[PDB]
């Protein structure tokens, strides 16, 4: 029962001076955090996952979307292995994508909700 | 015009200017065989009811 509000929104904004306050006011319920780029946003997501330490990471069609999308972005653009950062340890699955989620994070489980 | 040749998706069908469902194909080949089975187990042919 810690203070995380169980919900959150991360938005990219290079900072004009009206979008953050407008978004915060139109939300009025969930605390929104704004960052300068998407690399800072991914680092904040890693810190958030390491804070709560959830045993299950899920989503709707996480292959071509949220989790797989973030992983492919970090692998192609920023050259940053986020799968090794989200794991609970510091130090090519064809059967995966067929009947389950092909993403394998050490320590945590992955649930493809649509499957 | 084999069945594979038309094969429009809902997006293509709802945006096409002159596109109408194949009423003949739909009716016959998706309604007449199963009703024919179910009602020939009784003794009536459903195909004759559609031609009229």
């Amino acid at each position: 029962d810690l203070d995380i509000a169980y919900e959150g929104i991360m938005i990219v904004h290079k900072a004009d001076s009206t979008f953050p306050t407008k978004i915060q006011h139109c939300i009025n319920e969930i605390p929104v955090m704004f960052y300068e780029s998407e690399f800072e946003m991914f680092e904040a997501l890693t810190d958030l996952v390491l804070l709560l330490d959830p045993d299950i990471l899920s989503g709707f069609e996480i292959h071509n979307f949220s989790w797989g999308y973030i992983i492919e972005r970090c692998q192609k653009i920023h050259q940053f292995d986020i799968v090794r950062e989200l794991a609970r340890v510091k130090c090519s699955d064809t059967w995966g994508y067929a009947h389950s989620s092909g993403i394998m994070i050490t320590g945590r489980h992955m649930i493809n909700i649509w499957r | 015009q084999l069945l594979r040749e038309r094969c429009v998706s809902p997006e293509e069908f709802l945006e096409g200017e002159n596109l109408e469902l194949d009423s003949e194909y739909y009716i016959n080949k998706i309604l007449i065989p199963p009703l024919d089975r179910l009602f020939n187990l009784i003794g009536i042919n459903v195909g004759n009811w559609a031609q009229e």
Partner: protein, 357 residues
């Protein structure tokens, strides 16, 4: 309770150098140390809600093959045969995968008694126990021994289709999403992790009591230089196989070494908890009780079938064939020789090779 309870949320294994918490020797080739030993990582959550990483040591995979000698050994030829097969296995595996020191694939070979499961066997059979080091290549090693590449003759492999994690969970009465009742632990570099700030927001009074009960900070915490933390979470512990007390609750029976049944229903222990939960959730619905009446059934004289007469004739012919003049009895059939007292039973053999206190 009085035990440190850890749940099985996820598990994985890795390789590491043998520390003082890992076994480094054996009984067949004791003078040859190990180059790498397997360690199991158990990502679990304490009963209070805090995640914990557990490094289980001493768990080595194994597989059985048929013994080659006779049951009339003098307990000294057994060690010689074990050393010989260990040397042969190590040499052949090193030759395949490209003074025989620093064992890298085979850990130890022992002699255990057993009863085969694929068929009706009513007598003790002697087996080997090829304790391996790297489980990932285990199957591959079997693919050699079963092919006749190691020895001259082909050898059938026993208990190799069971993975390493399944063997570990079965040998210690462990279940997925169930608690690991352990009475002793070994803590690592700072107990409360300070990755970003979690050493302050997540701690409460219950976790502090659990720490004060099991952490002494004088002779219980491992050094930071030899055992650094490799977990991105809360408290990290190390346990020995002697510490896991989920075992010793298993009921080991030996009713298959003789015609003992010839002169109790809850065999699956994980079903009793489901039954109890069902009784609870049906008593919450004001249901009276559960009961089942037995129906008096009268089967056929022998439940005969179409070819029952031919089957009886063939059984008579086979009984005439497989017979040599005498009469068999249920008491004098199995010979009362080869006492098999010194030979270890599979559940009495795995406590061996555990490193030390």
């Amino acid at each position: 309770s009085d035990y440190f309870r850890i749940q099985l949320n996820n598990q994985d294994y890795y390789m590491s150098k043998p520390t003082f918490l890992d076994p480094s020797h054996g009984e067949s080739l004791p003078l040859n140390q190990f180059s790498q030993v397997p360690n199991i990582r158990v990502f679990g959550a304490l009963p209070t809600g805090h995640q914990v990483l557990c490094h289980v040591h001493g768990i080595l995979p194994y597989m059985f093959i048929k013994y080659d000698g006779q049951i009339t050994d003098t307990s000294t030829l057994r060690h010689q045969r074990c050393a010989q097969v260990h040397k042969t296995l190590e040499v052949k595996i090193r030759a395949s995968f490209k003074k025989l020191g620093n064992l890298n694939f085979v850990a130890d070979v022992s002699v255990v008694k057993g009863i085969p499961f694929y068929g009706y066997h009513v007598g003790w059979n002697l087996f080997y126990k090829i304790s391996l080091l790297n489980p990932s290549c285990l199957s591959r090693i079997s693919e050699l021994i079963r092919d006749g590449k190691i020895f001259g003759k082909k050898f059938e492999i026993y208990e190799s289709h069971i993975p390493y994690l399944l063997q570990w969970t079965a040998d210690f009465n462990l279940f997925g999403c169930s608690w690991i009742n352990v009475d002793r632990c070994y803590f690592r570099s700072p107990v409360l992790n300070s990755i970003l700030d979690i050493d302050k927001l997540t701690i409460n009074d219950d976790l502090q009591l659990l720490l004060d009960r099991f952490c002494d900070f004088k002779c219980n915490v491992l050094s930071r230089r030899d055992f650094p933390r490799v977990g991105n979470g809360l408290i990290e512990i190390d346990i020995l196989p002697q510490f896991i007390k989920n075992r010793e609750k298993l009921q080991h029976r030996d009713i298959h070494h003789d015609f003992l049944e010839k002169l109790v229903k809850p065999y699956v222990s994980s079903a009793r908890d489901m039954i109890n939960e069902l009784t609870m959730q049906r008593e919450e619905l004001s249901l009276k009780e559960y009961k089942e009446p037995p129906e008096t059934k009268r089967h056929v004289s022998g439940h005969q079938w179409q070819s029952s007469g031919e089957f009886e004739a063939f059984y008579k012919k086979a009984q005439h064939k497989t017979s040599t003049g005498q009469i068999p009895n249920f008491e004098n059939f199995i010979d009362k020789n080869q006492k098999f007292s010194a030979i270890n039973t599979p559940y009495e053999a795995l406590p061996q090779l555990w490193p030390r206190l």
